[PDB]
Amino acid sequence: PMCKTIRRDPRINWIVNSVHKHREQRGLTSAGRKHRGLRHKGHKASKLRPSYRAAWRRNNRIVFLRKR
């Protein structure tokens, strides 16, 4: 990410931005997406999108509406 050729290339210089540091550690590459189940969409992937934890969070948290 420090090479000038990389930094001045609009096709690859997205990876210079620090949100992509160690993206493989976070399962963000193609192989990580594969084992996360993110090759599938719709009814074959509803319980794992945008992640398993995200779906668990929105399926298991108790909602208290103000007027209920």
Partner: protein
């Protein structure tokens, strides 16, 4: 005692001379501070210390500005000691600059020129 204005108008050799005199004076006052001494004599230790601080402040500000203007030339910029470069932040120093951020492919530029964003209204 030393007004900062006089020190700005003072040369480097003269600054070093007056630093030596103020250091010597503070040393003598330390001797007095050991053997009792009068309140008036003990009470000039702090002005002498603050004057020494002023002389060192002028000396270091002048040295750093002169060095910065020395390494600012095209030839010697890339060898600038890291203590003279802008600090900012580690991530900001590593981050893409606006020119690098704004790079576009030639097709992207042609597309941006072919269909600019317009201003319009409806009645």
């Amino acid at each position: 005692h030393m007004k900062i204005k006089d020190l700005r108008e003072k040369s480097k050799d003269d600054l070093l001379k007056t630093l030596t005199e103020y250091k010597k004076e503070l040393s003598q006052l330390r001797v007095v501070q050991q053997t009792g001494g009068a309140e008036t004599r003990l009470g000039r230790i702090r002005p002498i210390r603050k004057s020494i601080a002023r002389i060192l402040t002028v000396l270091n500000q002048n040295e750093r500005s002169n060095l910065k203007m020395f390494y600012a030339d095209r030839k010697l910029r890339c060898k600038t000691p890291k203590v003279l470069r802008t600090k900012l932040t580690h991530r900001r120093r590593l981050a893409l600059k606006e020119n690098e951020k704004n790079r576009k492919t030639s097709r992207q530029m042609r597309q941006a020129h072919k269909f600019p964003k317009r201003v319009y209204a409806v009645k």
